[PDB]
Design a protein around this ligand. Sequence first.
Ligand SMILES: CNC(=O)[C@H](CCCCNC(C)=O)NC(C)=O
Length: 129
Amino acid sequence: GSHMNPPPPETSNPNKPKRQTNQLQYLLRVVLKTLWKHQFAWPFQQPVDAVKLNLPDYYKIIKTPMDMGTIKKRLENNYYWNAQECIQDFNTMFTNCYIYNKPGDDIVLMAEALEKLFLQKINELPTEE
Ligand SMILES: CNC(=O)[C@H](CCCCNC(C)=O)NC(C)=O
């Protein structure tokens, strides 16, 4: 894509420690699956294209971008060490939306719907086995 968008967050790195846990499996099979198919997921399914959206300040404001396409690939590629690393990426995605956009805005209402669902599912994250 455009040189004015940053490289997306990495989804592979042989230097990073990785493991599968039952909590990470739940984050893929239950949490990400649930959020991904929601009516309001689409703005979150890939990195923000600030060029296409005509938002040239987006990567000046948001210095820790994150999206669910990145999270999906990180889960599928077993990139994470633990559930906390994955939960933080979801938390980062939601907070970026709330920092960059205004309380009334369509994208904020969309994020809030996804976040409500996320919280329902994380409250049920299984005991680590
Ligand atoms: C051109 N503007 C849009 O398309 C809007 C606003 C997008 C803001 C950037 N994305 C995020 C996730 O913060 N997207 C809608 C309203 O769904």
